[PDB]
Design an enzyme around this catalytic site. Sequence first.
Site, PDB file in Angstrom:
ATOM      1  N   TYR A   1      -2.079  -2.298  -0.051  1.00 39.20           N
ATOM      2  CA  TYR A   1      -3.256  -2.121  -0.931  1.00 39.20           C
ATOM      3  C   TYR A   1      -4.232  -3.295  -0.726  1.00 39.20           C
ATOM      4  CZ  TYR A   1      -5.731  -1.936  -5.469  1.00 39.20           C
ATOM      5  OH  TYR A   1      -6.650  -1.913  -6.475  1.00 39.20           O
TER       6      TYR A   1
ATOM      7  N   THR B   1     -10.326  -5.618  -5.721  1.00 37.02           N
ATOM      8  CA  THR B   1      -9.112  -5.858  -6.522  1.00 37.02           C
ATOM      9  C   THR B   1      -8.661  -7.308  -6.323  1.00 37.02           C
ATOM     10  OG1 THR B   1      -6.858  -5.162  -6.865  1.00 37.02           O
ATOM     11  CG2 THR B   1      -7.716  -4.945  -4.627  1.00 37.02           C
TER      12      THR B   1
END
Lengths: 311, 306
Positions: free
Chosen positions: A145, A122
């Site tokens: 995250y 990501t």
Amino acid sequence: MKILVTGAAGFIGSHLCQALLKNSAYHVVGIDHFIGPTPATLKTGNIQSLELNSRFQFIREDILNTDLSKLLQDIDVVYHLAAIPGWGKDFQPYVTNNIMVTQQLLEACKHIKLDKFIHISTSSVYGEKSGAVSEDLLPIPLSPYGVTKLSGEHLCHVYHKNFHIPIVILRYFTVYGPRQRPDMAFHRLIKQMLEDKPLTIFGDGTQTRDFTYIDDCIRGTVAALETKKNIIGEVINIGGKEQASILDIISMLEKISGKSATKNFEPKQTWADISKASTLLQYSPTVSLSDGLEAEYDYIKQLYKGDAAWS
Amino acid sequence: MKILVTGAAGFIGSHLCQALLKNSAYHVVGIDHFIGPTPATLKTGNIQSLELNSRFQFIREDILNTDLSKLLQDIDVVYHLAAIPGWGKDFQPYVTNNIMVTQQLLEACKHIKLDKFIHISTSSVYGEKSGAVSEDLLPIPLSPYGVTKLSGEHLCHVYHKNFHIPIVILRYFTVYGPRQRPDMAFHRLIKQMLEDKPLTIFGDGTQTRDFTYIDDCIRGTVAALETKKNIIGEVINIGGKEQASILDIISMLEKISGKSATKNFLKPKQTWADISKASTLLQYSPTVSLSDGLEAEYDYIKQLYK
Ligand SMILES: NC(=O)c1ccc[n+]([C@@H]2O[C@H](COP(=O)([O-])OP(=O)(O)OC[C@H]3O[C@@H](n4cnc5c(N)ncnc54)[C@H](O)[C@@H]3O)[C@@H](O)[C@H]2O)c1
Ligand SMILES: NC(=O)c1ccc[n+]([C@@H]2O[C@H](COP(=O)([O-])OP(=O)(O)OC[C@H]3O[C@@H](n4cnc5c(N)ncnc54)[C@H](O)[C@@H]3O)[C@@H](O)[C@H]2O)c1
């Protein structure tokens, strides 16, 4: 050729499994435990068509509570998309599903002959950058995250250097379209527009960002398997055709729906550098925001107001 | 000022509690669960001095199994040294003690007015590098220790950006001296030489590296607190006076012991810390020579294994 996709019932995994199965030579095994921010009710619809395909096998199991040697026998290629994407005491699930899952998959891939271990990561690993974001940039993640996903990437390099697992890292920037997760911006804006509600907007919404239409994301992901170049060990950004502010997005949505939005109100400007992907993958995003947003709009309309088996 | 030192019974944390308590203004709370490679007796040995001091409190408990709101009540500064040093099933302890400890510590500090959270990290975050290693280089860890320590650093940036925890990251290069852990190379080499056993070298022992004497390490660690400059958010390499190969080190150990060693070779040539940033921000200048440092460690190892 036989391909394992982890997170195969999710937004991107469900589309990837389907794009792979268009090649009549490819056999796909998907594993998904139905966790993270998308409720299982809404998620079941993602694999409706997938389970019609005789060359697709689905396993509903936790990667951390499944026979991995069995899951990986006869597997040529792993696409690892299983993650918790999108704090406090909520932190353990990120560690379990983004770090321990990746470590245990990589451990089980040592005793196995893979062509490629394609690890999906990501743009949240980068943290804050004004302008072009390239793969040589020093990552300083600013979310849990991002931290746990970057840890997953680092384990990929540890297992490549030490045990010769043929890892490839794709860093996805914001992906949108049919099946987009309900926690994501475009899903939330569109569901609010459909429900004649105020559109939540954090900041003044003029900050321009990179967005990737699912079909462009999936072409780049498939090209990571099919490229003739040697990409083993590489980190590759997969980012979008057009950049846009949250106010540009709402403009285009009002054009799509013919409605008007009660707006309810951090570098100015950032985008994925996709030059590495252009050179290594022949990657070229082709879908316009206006086409992409129309397709997401119709998906969300049918999801909440329709009568499809996946409503 | 009241200072929490995590890993306070360890090699570096015990020396750090000792140096801070020299300041009559400073009150120190130490927490340590007595885990990792060093045996318990050596750690009780490390804090034997500290326990006598009335401005020192010690807690023998897991950071993950303690009341951190009690622990942090009136704390002005955290020194976070607690960690497990360096497959399959052995991976959870790195994640638990290097990632979850840091996250829970940072969570407990989120809503407290600290002056500073000084997070201790490691050169192992860099991975394989050639030449000078500066804080701007892309870290590519090669070990589970490296990955988990790198994740700890990243948690610090997350909590700095989102909750204004006033974080400072120090990256220690290899630290040596009295109380060095028994898994570390100088400890092992000195023990082997005391027993007239072959000195076990992994590789050909000609790669020259950075070594930091513990007293120089502590002076830089204290400067991270006492510096007049704003260093909030900075990563700073703490490195050593002299570069040496393991063969250089063994030649100095021979000078101390007065005898030649048997060398036993089992299974990147030049790498050193760029300490420019520490010079500018901390007025850090390591002053203890290898030969002086090795003497001090040698005496410590000899008193253990006489
Ligand atoms: N959606 C985006 O814009 C975007 C952006 C950057 C990167 N990514 C990455 O792409 C991947 C897919 O994202 P998404 O948006 O499709 O997420 P998603 O939640 O829709 O899909 C992830 C899937 O992984 C599954 N899963 C998680 N932990 C599991 C476990 N232990 N065992 C089995 N299954 C497990 C979940 O059930 C879920 O279906 C993730 O790795 C994510 O970090 C996505
Ligand atoms: N020794 C070196 O050369 C070196 C090199 C670079 C970085 N570092 C870093 O310096 C710090 C201290 O290293 P050291 O050599 O003194 O190690 P050490 O093992 O002697 O000290 C660390 C201490 O942390 C404690 N600890 C670990 N997990 C804990 C937990 N969950 N709860 C409570 N206490 C816990 C241990 O009991 C131990 O005494 C670490 O953060 C290490 O990564 C050391």
